[PDB]
Amino acid sequence: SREQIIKDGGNILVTAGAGSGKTTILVSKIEADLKENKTHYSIAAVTFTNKAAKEIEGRLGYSSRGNFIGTNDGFVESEIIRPFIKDAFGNDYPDNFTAEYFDNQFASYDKGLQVLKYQNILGTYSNPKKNFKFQLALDILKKSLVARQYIFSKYFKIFIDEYQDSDKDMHNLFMYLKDQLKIKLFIVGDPWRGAEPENFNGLIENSTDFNKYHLTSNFPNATLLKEVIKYVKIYDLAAEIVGNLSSREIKEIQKIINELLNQVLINQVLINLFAKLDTREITAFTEV
Amino acid sequence: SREQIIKDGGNILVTAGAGSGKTTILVSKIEADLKENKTHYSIAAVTFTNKAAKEIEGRLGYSSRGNFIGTNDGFVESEIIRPFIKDAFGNDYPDNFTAEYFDNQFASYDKGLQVLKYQNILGTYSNPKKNFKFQLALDILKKSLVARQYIFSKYFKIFIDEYQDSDKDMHNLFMYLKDQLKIKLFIVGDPWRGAEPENFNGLIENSTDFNKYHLTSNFPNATLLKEVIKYVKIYDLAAEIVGNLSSREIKEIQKIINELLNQVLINQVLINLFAKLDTREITAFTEV
């Protein structure tokens, strides 16, 4: 149910099914906490989908509290990486770089860290098992005292959804926030490229202090094929894909999409789009 | 004489020797033109040395006219590249780029452009004779209408001292600003590594619309070792270098300079200092 989780103020684990109630329970809990808390502290809402952040933000409405509603990748950049990169790693490192997921991939953290200073763009990890950005954000927090002070003094609770898609390294940063930075966590999981269901599924059994709640249902890549199909009938398409797409990257993507709008050329376009980031899905695209 | 220069409103050649009179006559002419002109137009004072910019800028004082006093590369980036890069070359190209002379050098213009789109950070040309940044600025002006409109409607006269030390690429842009965009020019030449004095000397007699005014004396790398010697006894001597210097590059300069403060170590740090950027000079350094 919804009443008892509203009363609870500690760490809350929600096991909503099919995502029907995830966004609804997120908005309700956020409003309840914001109206109850009269202090200067604010909340941060992080979503894998950029569109999911936008629809959530629209439901809270205008507010000057300073709350953060955005993507998981956009949270670390805006709140941890951008302001405190120079303090943690000296003035040489830049704070005006740009994150590009498709280009400039590296193989090792040390190589990824060493290219970062000279490249002046936020690089990405070629391997899908690890996320370099969240390792860098975690490293910044440990190194920088002011970064630790700011995070504690800014946020009192963090709202996370789609936690079963969270990477193991991404899980590592959040548990850093919860354990010594003493920040309440409201994470939602359901039974992303480097998705690690292991960390979320094992979290329920490993930790007993966390509170778990399972709401009733009523009260994998086919999504993006439907989105390009409806677009054929581009910025909205960007919100569906996880992360924040660069202008250069989306212009290249849009060039491929307008090339789509015969069956043979349809299949080749879907192949390269998948390469940039199933035999049944291509047939469905051919049908529509 | 000085009063002959002041009342002239056209294009002025100044041939002052040793730089004693050219520095004070540049400030005097700038003040005279600013006082005389009551319109919204401003002037741009560009110098090879960053130090020369501040010493000139300190002689005008605080003003809301919107005048520009700075380096040649600083003028091109702040007034042409940064605002109008996206308009000329599409939204894919960035404007949060940074200038780094020591790394990411380009061998070809088209390759230099194509690496710029993906690396997203400005750099210098590998060949010192060519300055990739300035033809990029010239290319931006030719392609962007708003960039051409802004420059014409902002500045009515440009002050470029040490024009005999100007490069061919820099000369190409300034002449485009003069004859094509109809902007008054005020240059100084007294007969940067990759430049040539031939262009200025040739332009003395090649151009008939230009005015040749002679300024008498009384009215190569010796400095760089003197600046570090007084530093031994970091942002100051870095400012004396030609062009804007990145913070990381300054830090690298700092870590290679502090090693100097035996004789053999002195010679080797001088050698790679030149490599990053004479037998008599190293001996003089050993003496001091």
Side-chain angles (χ1 to χ4, degrees):
Chain A
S1 183
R2 44 177 327 167
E3 217 278 342
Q4 66 305 21
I5 64 95
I6 283 318
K7 314 190 282 268
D8 202 1
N11 295 322
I12 288 144
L13 199 142
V14 159
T15 316
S20 207
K22 295 186 170 64
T23 283
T24 91
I25 204 61
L26 265 201
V27 164
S28 97
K29 180 62 169 170
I30 284 162
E31 301 253 3
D33 255 348
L34 285 184
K35 84 174 313 262
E36 171 209 319
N37 180 280
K38 298 302 170 169
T39 66
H40 77 275
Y41 293 94
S42 71
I43 55 103
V46 295
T47 69
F48 273 97
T49 303
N50 206 306
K51 189 184 75 67
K54 256 104 56 178
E55 62 156 5
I56 287 196
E57 181 303 336
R59 291 167 68 164
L60 296 325
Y62 182 75
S63 166
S64 163
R65 186 115 174 208
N67 295 301
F68 179 81
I69 327 286
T71 90
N72 293 275
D73 319 51
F75 168 77
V76 283
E77 293 180 16
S78 148
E79 299 303 271
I80 296 176
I81 306 269
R82 278 321 156 63
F84 310 111
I85 173 75
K86 292 211 195 275
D87 173 84
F89 287 134
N91 281 310
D92 42 339
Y93 287 68
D95 66 350
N96 78 318
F97 53 63
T98 300
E100 319 190 293
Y101 305 82
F102 316 143
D103 295 305
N104 308 87
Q105 278 89 341
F106 36 81
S108 150
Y109 179 39
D110 229 2
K111 173 189 171 184
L113 199 33
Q114 87 64 12
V115 298
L116 168 59
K117 177 198 314 201
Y118 322 130
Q119 75 185 136
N120 197 165
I121 69 183
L122 181 47
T124 166
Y125 208 45
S126 332
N127 208 42
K129 185 53 168 64
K130 299 306 183 184
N131 186 7
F132 152 81
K133 159 181 320 193
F134 267 66
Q135 294 133 30
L136 169 68
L138 182 51
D139 193 21
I140 281 188
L141 269 182
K142 304 214 186 149
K143 288 211 174 321
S144 181
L145 160 70
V146 289
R148 266 177 280 117
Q149 285 181 346
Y150 163 71
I151 281 299
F152 182 85
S153 34
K154 177 71 165 173
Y155 302 115
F156 76 100
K157 196 173 290 177
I158 305 294
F159 288 95
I160 304 169
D161 59 357
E162 305 294 329
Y163 193 76
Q164 83 299 45
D165 281 43
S166 85
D167 187 64
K168 182 69 151 55
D169 172 44
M170 157 175 330
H171 153 95
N172 222 8
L173 163 71
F174 287 132
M175 256 32 61
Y176 181 102
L177 295 183
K178 185 188 65 59
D179 290 346
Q180 49 285 19
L181 262 47
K182 298 308 187 292
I183 303 195
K184 306 288 174 307
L185 276 171
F186 188 101
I187 61 106
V188 177
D190 170 70
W192 143 259
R193 140 160 160 281
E196 182 78 13
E198 190 272 333
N199 59 19
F200 157 68
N201 290 253
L203 188 65
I204 311 114
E205 297 87 284
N206 289 357
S207 96
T208 78
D209 48 57
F210 221 101
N211 274 13
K212 58 188 136 194
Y213 300 91
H214 311 46
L215 56 99
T216 80
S217 317
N218 38 13
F219 29 63
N221 30 348
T223 54
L224 41 66
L225 293 325
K226 204 39 154 133
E227 260 304 277
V228 53
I229 277 156
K230 77 84 208 163
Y231 168 67
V232 158
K233 105 187 183 169
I234 179 73
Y235 292 127
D236 39 358
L237 177 52
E240 328 293 338
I241 314 140
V242 299
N244 313 328
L245 256 285
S246 147
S247 192
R248 175 177 72 81
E249 288 179 336
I250 201 91
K251 158 164 292 153
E252 166 260 329
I253 285 320
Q254 181 178 2
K255 176 190 43 53
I256 299 303
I257 301 288
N258 71 59
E259 190 40 66
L260 194 294
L261 71 100
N262 264 269
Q263 174 259 2
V264 184
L265 51 96
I266 277 160
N267 289 266
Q268 310 318 305
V269 159
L270 278 50
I271 288 305
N272 65 53
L273 287 172
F274 191 44
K276 266 310 221 185
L277 65 97
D278 183 28
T279 58
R280 191 71 177 227
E281 263 156 332
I282 59 106
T283 60
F285 213 123
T286 299
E287 290 199 61
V288 194
Chain B
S1 188
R2 186 176 67 198
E3 85 284 357
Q4 206 39 6
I5 271 164
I6 259 46
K7 44 204 174 205
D8 206 339
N11 301 287
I12 271 51
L13 310 163
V14 158
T15 59
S20 154
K22 76 190 193 182
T23 311
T24 188
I25 204 151
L26 217 68
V27 175
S28 95
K29 174 61 134 144
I30 283 159
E31 299 257 347
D33 254 2
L34 286 188
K35 226 180 65 75
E36 178 266 350
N37 178 278
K38 301 288 154 187
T39 78
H40 76 276
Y41 291 95
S42 315
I43 55 104
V46 303
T47 65
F48 262 109
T49 305
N50 204 303
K51 162 258 305 178
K54 284 96 57 177
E55 69 157 24
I56 286 194
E57 187 275 325
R59 307 216 256 161
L60 305 312
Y62 175 77
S63 165
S64 36
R65 185 82 175 244
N67 291 306
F68 180 86
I69 304 96
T71 66
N72 298 92
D73 89 355
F75 167 79
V76 146
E77 299 171 342
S78 35
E79 294 306 312
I80 295 166
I81 315 272
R82 202 140 284 172
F84 310 109
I85 175 65
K86 293 209 195 276
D87 177 83
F89 284 132
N91 293 293
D92 37 48
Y93 278 77
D95 60 344
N96 67 339
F97 62 99
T98 320
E100 292 181 349
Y101 305 164
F102 298 158
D103 308 82
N104 313 81
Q105 281 91 341
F106 334 103
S108 173
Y109 176 42
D110 203 345
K111 190 185 72 66
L113 270 176
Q114 81 58 18
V115 298
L116 161 67
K117 189 203 316 189
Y118 314 132
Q119 184 61 238
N120 296 45
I121 275 70
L122 194 42
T124 201
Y125 212 94
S126 321
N127 166 225
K129 173 58 166 61
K130 300 299 179 63
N131 182 21
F132 162 72
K133 152 184 316 198
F134 257 76
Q135 39 277 13
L136 163 71
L138 182 50
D139 198 18
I140 280 188
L141 273 182
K142 299 225 184 135
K143 298 177 142 290
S144 163
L145 160 71
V146 289
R148 276 196 309 291
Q149 278 178 355
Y150 162 71
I151 280 297
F152 189 40
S153 55
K154 174 72 164 173
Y155 302 116
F156 77 100
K157 201 181 193 67
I158 312 300
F159 295 89
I160 314 108
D161 65 340
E162 272 289 319
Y163 180 75
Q164 98 288 20
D165 207 7
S166 95
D167 214 330
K168 178 50 69 179
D169 301 334
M170 282 170 29
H171 147 86
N172 237 355
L173 171 63
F174 285 142
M175 257 33 60
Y176 177 84
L177 287 189
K178 181 185 68 59
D179 45 58
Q180 208 305 350
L181 248 62
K182 321 305 190 200
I183 304 201
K184 303 293 185 289
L185 278 204
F186 190 110
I187 34 65
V188 178
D190 183 40
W192 165 279
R193 51 185 186 279
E196 79 194 346
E198 171 264 343
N199 50 34
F200 153 81
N201 289 258
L203 189 134
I204 283 178
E205 59 275 355
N206 282 3
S207 59
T208 165
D209 42 47
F210 223 110
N211 284 8
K212 35 177 70 180
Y213 287 23
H214 198 324
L215 201 286
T216 84
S217 288
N218 189 355
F219 270 140
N221 28 347
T223 56
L224 52 59
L225 55 166
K226 253 318 199 163
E227 276 312 296
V228 57
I229 273 155
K230 75 92 201 155
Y231 166 65
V232 159
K233 98 199 178 159
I234 183 64
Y235 302 119
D236 39 353
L237 84 186
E240 330 285 347
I241 327 287
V242 187
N244 246 27
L245 256 282
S246 162
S247 101
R248 155 193 149 223
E249 291 182 343
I250 295 152
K251 280 193 178 300
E252 161 258 349
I253 288 329
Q254 194 178 5
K255 99 178 82 94
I256 191 189
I257 281 305
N258 51 43
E259 194 43 73
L260 208 153
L261 49 88
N262 265 251
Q263 177 264 354
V264 181
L265 270 73
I266 282 160
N267 324 133
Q268 65 164 29
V269 300
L270 274 274
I271 289 305
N272 45 37
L273 263 173
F274 198 35
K276 263 298 211 191
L277 265 44
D278 184 28
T279 58
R280 188 63 174 239
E281 265 161 319
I282 59 106
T283 61
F285 217 136
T286 305
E287 292 190 62
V288 198

